[PDB]
RNA sequence: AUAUGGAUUCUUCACGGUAACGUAACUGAAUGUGGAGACGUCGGCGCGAGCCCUGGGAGGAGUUAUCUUUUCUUCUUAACAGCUUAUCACCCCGGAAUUGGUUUAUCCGGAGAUGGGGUCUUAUGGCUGGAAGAGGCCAGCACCUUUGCUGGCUCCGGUGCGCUUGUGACGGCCCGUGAAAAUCCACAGGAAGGAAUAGUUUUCAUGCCAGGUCGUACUGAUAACCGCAGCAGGUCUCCAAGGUGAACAGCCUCUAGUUGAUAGAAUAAUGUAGAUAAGGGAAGUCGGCAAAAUAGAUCCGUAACUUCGGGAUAAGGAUUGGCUCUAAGGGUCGGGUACGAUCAACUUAGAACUGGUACGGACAAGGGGAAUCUGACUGUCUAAUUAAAACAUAGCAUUGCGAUGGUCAGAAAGUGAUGUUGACGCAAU
RNA sequence: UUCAAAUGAGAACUUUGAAGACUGAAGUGGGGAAAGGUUCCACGUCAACAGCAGUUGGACGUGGGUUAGUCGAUCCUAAGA
RNA sequence: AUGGUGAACUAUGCCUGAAUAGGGUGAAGCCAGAGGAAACUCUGGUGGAGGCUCGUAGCGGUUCUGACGUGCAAAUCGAUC
């Protein structure tokens, strides 16, 4: 009745082209993700990590993949990376950042 | 928002032109024409919808196994059973009284 | 709480037609809509249905009767006259 | 219209064949005198009166 | 237009004189709540009705498909 | 057209149920009879469908100086078939005053209520078949091409004086009581035909062949029709989103569709159409013609007269925004034979604070009053100069007539209207 | 109503992209009855016609297009004939 | 004068169809209650009556003696009704 959901994003394809910094990026998530209504309250309820080439999110609080696309769109817009990279579902809940 | 058209050349709102909006596998709304409704057959004695008998527009009763058009009793698919009850009772009793009417005035003639 | 001093069911007709006329109607309207005792089964369930026709709620008997009331004063004397005359023929 | 009798479909169809201009080869025959088609008809100029 | 469940009645259908062809269908679905499972409908086509027998058990299906008359025209998937 | 399977029969034309009735079937001539075809309008109330609104999740898109777990959008399921599903109606048990049951709407019962237990109609709905293979949304590879090729996802819910339509059980109305026939079924009847060495059975299932003829385009209107025309006129109907609001009003929007109507430059007089105007307030004029004023809703307040129904929104008043709070009004469950737990609604009254005293802030929306004349009223007419006091009307009264008749039609008639008629009628004033 | 492109001898008026608006679901949306009869669609295309224009059209030339056991007719009866 | 043709407009009857936003009023019937010695009288509800009323669509056509009056139009257009 509690449930713990995970969210994978392959940030490789734009990371390798230099114009992407999974460092300050996962940092964007890590403190602008809303947790019963405000930033930071990720109170061991949600986690963000990086696999160097992959971002991981695991939640226990209300957090949907539509949210996860909303935030990165915002990060990707905050640093001018629109035009260059899209957020995309590859398989269900498996996302990635497509370059070209 | 999704509107709809008649499916026949008749454009007027009559009893033989009733519509019914419907969602197809296509995801579109569509008119469907609806046959007039069936009404229940009735007791030719008391007048009620006579129970146990199926109901469909008249010619459709010729496309139906005989059991749908009857119940298993005297005067089955035709009178309401409480009607049958009645006309059995009255039959018996009047047929009986006929005996009481005859032999009684058979005495009248003999005692006159 | 009483709604009308006098016009009763006739109160639909507002101000129209003239008082006198409303009265004549009201008398007869009260007669026609009223609920009547059944000679046959004995419940007060005879209600009218178009002039002349009087039919029992339950038991479904229908008597022919007055236009606005079940039994015409006339007809009922007639019922009795025929009584009288009939009687003579056996006795 | 929109749901017509075969009688009327005909006249309609007959009237469609009569609605061509002169066959110009006629223009060339000896003594030929017909300049143009003087019996032409338009749907929005003369009504067929059935 | 007709559904079937007797896996004996089914077999006899497929040997009817008018039953020319049949088709076998495979849906991935899910069980109770926890997980999925492979469903299989056995549609036979009569001159006036398509009888279809759903077999919810993967095992029963593999044995059934061999019971099929070799003179029958089966459309797989 | 018919053939196999099943059903039926040695108790020949089935069984089961106390019964309403059940069913895969379970013979039926003449003849009779019953039903369905098959029927007004309004009102509320109940339910269905489609639409509207809305939570979570999975997708794609939009905005991101800033803010928004955001804005927008996809998430669908036909006829037909199986099972199941109903208000109504009815059956069995039983026997009712301390009368009970009961609708929003006061009806029901010793001609058997309340109670318990069953039976039917299948409108309608549910799950399965059809049927995911279709459709809808995406991503991931290919190449001048036909155009592919490969993957996914297509899930779970909420709400109701909502809107539209369908439908049921009821109620009101009538000197109005609101088609017909083709056609289909049933039952009463029982002429007849039919089994044991094998009959009867095509209203049960399955199976075979066949279905002609004519119309099918498009416009349906500020250009496809009628008005001499691509005419500001006329011309019968179905479908119907969000906001505000009482609303199918007005005003703004989504979807779809338009962006058609000669154009350019100026802005004299006089216009047509839209507006404002100090002080006065009808002095203008035949005449307040035109114009102005009023207006919603809540509360208060309301005269003569009256056929007692009205007159009445009479008249006359006050109030109204934003925002912030308080109170009242409901559903669902388990309680031995007082309360606890959650879910989902705009209404209505109140109290703070707030502003250049404004708030039905656009849109929308009655001027009132006292008399005289005249017609009672609603209703009708001179299409194209008269809408009225003129016609009609109920009401009142008079006349004719009992059918071999009144009144009226025709050249005639073995002719016709009233007449499917009968003085509570038809005809004539 | 506007800017551009394209087309063409020629573009205020055609096509396309952009912009601004409109009708506002009692529609300038989606369909039909009566009536019209090919106007429907495509290609070609401007002499006349569309009260300015024209490369555009309901115009002109030349072709193509209307598929039914189940939608209508056909059958039934209505006032009437 | 004679013999013919019209009810596609319109008048009236019949037959068979279709159509009408939202409001105001609150008539019979019904329920509960109050007073009164009695006869009887009052209050609150519920209910949804009417050739009733406000007003769109509809139908009509009052005024401007408005527009137009070689018209959009051989009867239209606007506002008002
Ligand atoms: Mg059609
Ligand atoms: Mg109707
Ligand atoms: Mg018909
Ligand atoms: Mg039965
Ligand atoms: Mg049945
Ligand atoms: Mg049996
Ligand atoms: Mg009959
Ligand atoms: Mg009948
Ligand atoms: Mg009818
Ligand atoms: Mg939607
Ligand atoms: Mg069907
Ligand atoms: Mg019960
Ligand atoms: Mg029982
Ligand atoms: Mg309610
Ligand atoms: Mg409607
Ligand atoms: Mg009736
Ligand atoms: Mg029947
Ligand atoms: Mg059969
Ligand atoms: Mg033949
Ligand atoms: Mg068509
Ligand atoms: Mg069309
Ligand atoms: Mg057009
Ligand atoms: Mg014309
Ligand atoms: Mg002409
Ligand atoms: Mg015109
Ligand atoms: Mg169009
Ligand atoms: Mg012009
Ligand atoms: Mg000019
Ligand atoms: Mg002044
Ligand atoms: Mg003054
Ligand atoms: Mg003065
Ligand atoms: Mg003066
Ligand atoms: Mg004067
Ligand atoms: Mg004077
Ligand atoms: Mg005035
Ligand atoms: Mg002023
Ligand atoms: Mg007076
Ligand atoms: Mg007054
Ligand atoms: Mg205030
Ligand atoms: Mg509360
Ligand atoms: Mg509560
Ligand atoms: Mg008058
Ligand atoms: Mg006149
Ligand atoms: Mg004249
Ligand atoms: Mg008038
Ligand atoms: Mg006039
Ligand atoms: Mg008088
Ligand atoms: Mg003669
Ligand atoms: Mg232009
Ligand atoms: Mg353009
Ligand atoms: Mg607009
Ligand atoms: Mg509107
Ligand atoms: Mg137009
Ligand atoms: Mg035409
Ligand atoms: Mg042609
Ligand atoms: Mg064209
Ligand atoms: Mg030219
Ligand atoms: Mg032209
Ligand atoms: Mg020109
Ligand atoms: Mg020219
Ligand atoms: Mg052509
Ligand atoms: Mg048919
Ligand atoms: Mg035929
Ligand atoms: Mg006519
Ligand atoms: Mg209304
Ligand atoms: Mg009002
Ligand atoms: Mg009203
Ligand atoms: Mg007392
Ligand atoms: Mg009312
Ligand atoms: Mg009225
Ligand atoms: Mg009025
Ligand atoms: Mg109003
Ligand atoms: Mg009008
Ligand atoms: Mg009128
Ligand atoms: Mg006018
Ligand atoms: Mg004038
Ligand atoms: Mg002039
Ligand atoms: Mg008006
Ligand atoms: Zn009775």
Burial of B79 (0-12, 13-18, 19+ CB in 10 A): buried
For C40, list phi and psi in degrees, rounded to 5: -90, -50
G36 C1' closest Cα residue:
D1
F52 C1' closest Cα residue:
B1
Tokens 């995801």, residue located: B27
String of DSSP letters for C25-76? HHHHHHHHHS-EE-TTT--EEEEE-STTEEEETTT--EEE--SSSSS-HHHH
Query: What's the DSSP call for residue C85?
Result: H
- Residue partners of C45: CB distance under 8 A and separation at least 6: C35, C36, C38, C56, C57, C58, C59
Å from the D7 CA to the H19 C1':
36
String of DSSP letters for B33-79? EEPPPP---B-SSS-SBPTT-----GGGGGSS-GGGG--SSTTGGGS
Burial of C10 (0-12, 13-18, 19+ CB in 10 A): buried
Experimental technique:
X-ray
Residue B89: in which H helix or E strand, if any? helix B82-110
Q: Taking the CB of residue B24, how many other CB atoms lie within 10 A of it? A: 9
Coil/strand/helix, residue D45: coil
Contact between residue E61 and residue E55 where contact means Cβ atoms under 8 Å apart: yes
Q: Taking the CB of residue C43, how many other CB atoms lie within 10 A of it? A: 13
- Give ∠ CA C18-C22-C27 in degrees, rounded to 5: 155
Query: What's the DSSP call for residue D34?
Result: -
Instruction: Spell out a b/e string for E25-59, using b for 16 or more CB atoms within 10 Å of the CB, else e.
Output: eeeeeeeeeeeeeebbbbbbbeeeeebbbebeeee
Neighbours of ion ligand 17 (CB under 5 A): B 41
> Within 7 A of a protein CB, which nucleotides of strand F?
14-17, 20-26, 33-39, 49-52, 56-66, 68-71, 74-82, 88-91, 107-111, 119-123, 128-136, 138-141, 151-153, 165-168, 172-177, 183-188, 203-209, 214-220, 224-226, 230, 236-241, 254-255, 307-310, 376-377, 394-395, 424
The 3-class SS string of chain E reads CEEECCHHHHHHHCCCCCCCEEEEEEEECCECCCECCEEEEEEEEECCEEEEEEECCHHHHHHHHHHCCCCCEEEEC
Contact between residue B17 and residue B6 where contact means Cβ atoms under 8 Å apart: yes
- Residue partners of E7: CB distance under 8 A and separation at least 6: E53, E55, E60, E64
Q: Taking the CB of residue A81, how many other CB atoms lie within 10 A of it? A: 19
Tokens 């998937």, residue located: E77
Tokens 């209300």, residue located: A62
Taking the C-alpha atoms of residue B75 and residue B79, their distance in angstroms, rounded to an integer, is 6
Q: Which nucleotide is nearest to D23 (CA to C1')?
A: G61
Nearest to C49 by CA among C29, C61, C37, C33: C33
Determine if strand H comes within 7 Å of the CB of C11. yes
Q: Taking the CB of residue B19, how many other CB atoms lie within 10 A of it? A: 15
Contact between residue B21 and residue B31 where contact means Cβ atoms under 8 Å apart: yes
Taking the C-alpha atoms of residue B7 and residue C30, their distance in angstroms, rounded to an integer, is 52
Taking the C-alpha atoms of residue B86 and residue B88, their distance in angstroms, rounded to an integer, is 5
Contact between residue B30 and residue B22 where contact means Cβ atoms under 8 Å apart: yes
* Cα C55 to ligand 79 centre (Å): 8
Coil/strand/helix, residue B28: coil
Pairing of strands E49-55, E73-76: unpaired
Taking the C-alpha atoms of residue B72 and residue B52, their distance in angstroms, rounded to an integer, is 9
Determine if strand G comes within 7 Å of the CB of D38. no
Determine if strand G comes within 7 Å of the CB of B3. yes
Structure tokens at E32: 């109770």
Pairing of strands E38-46, E21-28: antiparallel
Contact between residue B83 and residue B46 where contact means Cβ atoms under 8 Å apart: yes
* Cα A37 to ligand 40 centre (Å): 27
Q: Which nucleotide is nearest to C8 (CA to C1')?
A: H28
Taking the C-alpha atoms of residue A93 and residue A4, their distance in angstroms, rounded to an integer, is 13
- Residue partners of D37: CB distance under 8 A and separation at least 6: D20, D21, D22
Tokens 């066959």, residue located: D23
For E66, list phi and psi in degrees, rounded to 5: -80, -30
């Amino acid at each position: 009745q509690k449930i713990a959901k995970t969210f994978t994003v392959d940030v490789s394809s734009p990371t390798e082209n230099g114009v992407f910094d999974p460092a300050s990026y996962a940092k964007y998530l890590i403190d602008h993700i809303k947790v019963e209504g405000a930033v930071g309250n990720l109170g061991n309820a949600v986690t963000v990590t990086e696999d160097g080439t992959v971002v991981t999110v695991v939640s226990t609080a209300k957090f949907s993949g539509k949210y996860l696309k909303y935030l990165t769109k915002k990060y990707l817009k905050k640093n001018q990376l629109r035009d260059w990279i899209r957020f995309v579902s590859t398989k269900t809940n498996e996302y990635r950042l497509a370059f070209y | 928002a999704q509107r709809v058209t008649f499916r026949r050349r008749n454009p007027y709102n009559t009893r033989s032109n009733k519509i019914k909006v419907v969602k197809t596998p296509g995801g579109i709304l569509r008119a469907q024409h609806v046959k007039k409704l069936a009404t229940r057959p009735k007791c030719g004695d008391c007048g009620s919808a006579l129970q146990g008998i199926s109901t469909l527009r008249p010619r459709q009763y010729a496309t139906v196994s005989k059991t749908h058009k009857t119940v298993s009793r005297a005067y089955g698919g035709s009178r309401c059973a409480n009607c049958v009850k009645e006309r059995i009772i009255r039959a018996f009793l009047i047929e009986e009284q006929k005996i009481v009417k005859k032999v009684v005035k058979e005495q009248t003639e003999a005692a006159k | 709480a009483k709604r009308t001093k006098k016009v009763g069911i006739t109160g639909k007709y507002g101000v129209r037609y003239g008082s006198s006329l409303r009265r004549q109607v009201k008398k007869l309207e009260i007669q026609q809509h009223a609920r009547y005792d059944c000679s046959f089964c004995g419940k007060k369930t005879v209600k009218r249905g178009a002039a002349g026709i009087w039919t029992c709620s339950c038991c479904k008997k229908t008597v022919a009767g007055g236009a606005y009331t079940v039994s015409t004063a006339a007809a009922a004397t007639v019922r009795s006259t025929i009584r009288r005359l009939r009687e003579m023929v056996e006795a | 219209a929109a749901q017509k009798s075969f009688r009327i479909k005909q006249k309609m169809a007959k009237a469609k064949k009569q609605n061509r201009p002169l066959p110009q080869w006629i223009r060339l025959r000896t003594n030929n005198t017909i300049r143009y088609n003087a019996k032409r008809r338009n749907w929005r100029r003369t009504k067929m009166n059935i | 237009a007709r559904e079937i469940t007797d896996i004996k009645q089914f077999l006899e259908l497929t040997r009817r004189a008018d039953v020319k062809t049949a088709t076998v269908k495979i849906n991935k679905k899910l069980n109770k709540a926890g997980k999925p499972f492979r469903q299989t409908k056995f549609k036979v086509r009569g001159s006036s009705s398509l009888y279809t027998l759903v077999i919810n058990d993967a095992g029963k299906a593999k044995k059934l498909i061999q019971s099929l008359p070799p003179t029958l025209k089966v459309n797989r998937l």
